Design a protein around this ligand. Structure first.
Ligand SMILES: CC(=O)N[C@@H]1[C@@H](O)[C@H](O[C@@H]2O[C@H](CO)[C@@H](O[C@@H]3O[C@H](CO)[C@@H](O[C@@H]4O[C@H](CO)[C@@H](O)[C@H](O)[C@H]4NC(C)=O)[C@H](O)[C@H]3NC(C)=O)[C@H](O)[C@H]2NC(C)=O)[C@@H](CO)O[C@H]1O
Length: 567
């Protein structure tokens, strides 16, 4: 037998290889920054500085032969390709006529976007998040936002993953018309332009590559040489920790829906669908696709867009086409992929789509049963109520009555049940509907007692403007506040109200509020009681389960109540 091969670690790139190349120190176009390979190029060097080198080598991964070639001289380079990610015990064998000798086993790392090379993620979850034995068949979803790692300081390892079936990752942009992005500020439009350089219109990209895959997280063991970092590497590790968990990219959202309006042309859908397939092959930790178009027929961020004739049919066609594409992926991989959508529940949004048609291709509809009322005007109301509140006029709930000016209502009032019933009325099965819970409040100021028509219902008052405050109190935008902020600064330990605020609950609507009489500050949100009511409602109707926006804003109370309501 010849001399046993000795691995040259430096000449073998410390045995670290990757199926994906990701730019870490620059920012450029998506296709410039991200290069995915179906086969990793492996290059291992070994030495035989004494005795006979032999004639032939064999490379083994966990005892399975993966390469073979010739040995010449004391130095040998073994170049081959390998397509499965993970950690393998590598042995290199040298053979001649007299026999074979093997190197000592050493670990080789081949990175892939399924996280197979990564150890399961260690968590840092707020202990206020409780442990539950909820039926795994019940949907328990939430949104994790890409930008939450900044001011909100909320990272993947903070998620109460044991209390979730679905993580929706917001948001994936589509290259093309995106004027609505400018309303965000923070240089987000320019960031999108950069990402889209070298990318065709209607193809998906990553908006924030720093957050997505570049940022080094010490809790995930990231270092300079780590081939995948950021939120994505952490989500990959999360898949290893919780194998039954579904992680789904959310495409669009309020600010990134503009390109959807061009899906009336099938050519644009074709381009999009193909890009999504590429995206799911590149990022293997993702378990499907979620479409967040706000909204078919219009009424979204872009006032100049919306086609009530063609948008709904395009939406249905998109779902059909996405399902065909996902079926291709299922055939190629043996995996199961999910197709979902978050949708508006206002009567004027629901009416623009035949969801009975669309839903045949879909696993779930995430019914966005919030944002019913808010700081966009000075009219108080329950933003996420199950039913019509006491503040509503007779006939307002169903929409058959008349407003202040004598003008008839144009449709049923904005409530969760009104939305759900409209979807059911179309023929959508209840077991595909997921009910939305809010982990945030919307709010006003100047709703002082004198503005109220009913003195002990602040929802009958009138605002002077939006709720204002600091990010310390969870106010990231005027008129919007994190639930955990409401709890910390308005509710207090026993939900009795602090800092001039009082707690109230509309039993008719199933909706809480906090009201400061002196400042006129009023906040509408979901709390333990209303979320219990939502869970009991979801069970009674046989809905698929519950979902929420956004997990960073919860302190545990809301997700806790979601589980307790579905018990
Ligand atoms: C029932 C019904 O039809 N109601 C309508 C309301 O939906 C509508 O109010 C609008 O509601 C959407 C959904 O909640 C909301 O969209 C959110 O917008 C914020 C910014 O305002 C986004 O958060 C930002 O995201 C960017 C990236 O895009 C981040 O960089 C930025 O840091 C984030 N800013 C903050 C403060 O966190 C959210 O991502 C986005 N949510 C979703 C789900 O996409 C709009 O803001 C609401 N519009 C207004 C004007 O308030 C209402 C008004 O149009 O009309 C009702 O009829």
């Amino acid at each position: 037998a010849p001399t046993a091969p000795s691995i040259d670690m430096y000449g073998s790139n410390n045995l670290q290889f990757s199926k994906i190349e990701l730019a870490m120190e620059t920012t450029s176009g998506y296709n410039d920054m991200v290069k995915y390979h179906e086969l990793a190029k492996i290059k291992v060097k070994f030495n035989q500085w004494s005795g006979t080198s032999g004639d032939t080598y064999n490379v083994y991964f966990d005892g399975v032969k993966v390469a073979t070639g010739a040995i010449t001289g004391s130095q040998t380079t073994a170049s081959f390709e390998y397509g499965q990610g993970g950690l393998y015990q590598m042995e290199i064998e040298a053979c001649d006529a007299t026999g074979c000798s093997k190197s000592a086993p050493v670990e080789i790392t081949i990175a892939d976007t399924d996280g197979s090379h990564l150890k399961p993620l260690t968590m840092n979850v707020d202990p206020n998040n409780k442990s539950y034995n909820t039926d795994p068949s019940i949907v328990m979803g939430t949104y994790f936002v890409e930008w939450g790692i900044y001011g909100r300081d909320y990272t993947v390892d903070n998620m109460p993953v044991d209390n979730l079936t679905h993580i929706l990752y917001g948001f994936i942009p589509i290259c093309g018309p995106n004027e609505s992005v400018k309303s965000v500020g923070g240089n987000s439009f320019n960031a999108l332009q950069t990402a889209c350089r070298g990318v065709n219109d209607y193809e998906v990209v990553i908006h924030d590559p720093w957050a997505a895959y570049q940022k080094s997280f010490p809790q995930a063991g990231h270092e300079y040489s780590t081939p995948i970092k950021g939120n994505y590497a952490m989500l990959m590790a999360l898949k290893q920790r919780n194998p039954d968990l579904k992680i789904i990219p959310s495409i669009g959202g309020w600010t990134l829906s503009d390109p959807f309006y061009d899906f009336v042309d099938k050519k644009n859908r074709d381009t999009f669908v193909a890009s999504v397939k590429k995206f799911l092959k590149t990022w293997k930790f993702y378990d499907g696709v979620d479409i967040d178009w706000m909204f078919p027929g219009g009424g979204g961020a872009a006032a100049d867009k919306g086609d009530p004739v063609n948008d709904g049919p395009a939406y249905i066609a998109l779902m059909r086409e996405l399902r065909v594409m996902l079926d291709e992926l299922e055939a190629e991989t043996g995996r199961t992929y999910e197709l979902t959508s978050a949708i508006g529940v206002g009567y004027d949004k629901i009416e623009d789509v035949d969801y009975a048609d669309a839903v045949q291709y879909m696993d779930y509809i995430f019914a966005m049963t919030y944002d019913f009322y808010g700081g966009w005007n000075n009219v108080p109301g329950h933003q996420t109520a199950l039913y019509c509140g006491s503040f509503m006029r007779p006939g307002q709930c169903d929409g058959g009555g008349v407003d202040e000016n004598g003008e008839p209502y144009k449709g049923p009032a904005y409530t969760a049940d009104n939305g759900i019933q409209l979807l059911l009325a179309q023929g959508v099965p209840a077991n595909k509907l997921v009910l939305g819970t809010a982990m945030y409040g919307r709010g006003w100021e100047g709703v002082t007692p004198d503005t109220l028509t009913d003195p002990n219902d602040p929802m009958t008052g009138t605002a002077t403007g939006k709720l204002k405050g600091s990010t310390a109190q969870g106010v990231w935008e005027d008129g919007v506040i994190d639930y955990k902020g409401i709890k910390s600064f308005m509710l207090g330990a026993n939900n009795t109200g602090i800092n001039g605020f009082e707690y109230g609950y509309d039993a008719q609507a199933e909706a809480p509020w906090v009201w400061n009489r002196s400042t006129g500050e009023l906040i509408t949100f979901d709390d333990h009681r209303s979320v219990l009511a939502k869970g009991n409602y979801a069970k009674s109707l046989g809905l698929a389960g519950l979902f929420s926006w956004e997990i960073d804003a919860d302190n545990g109370d809301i997700l806790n109540a979601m589980h307790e309501g579905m018990a």
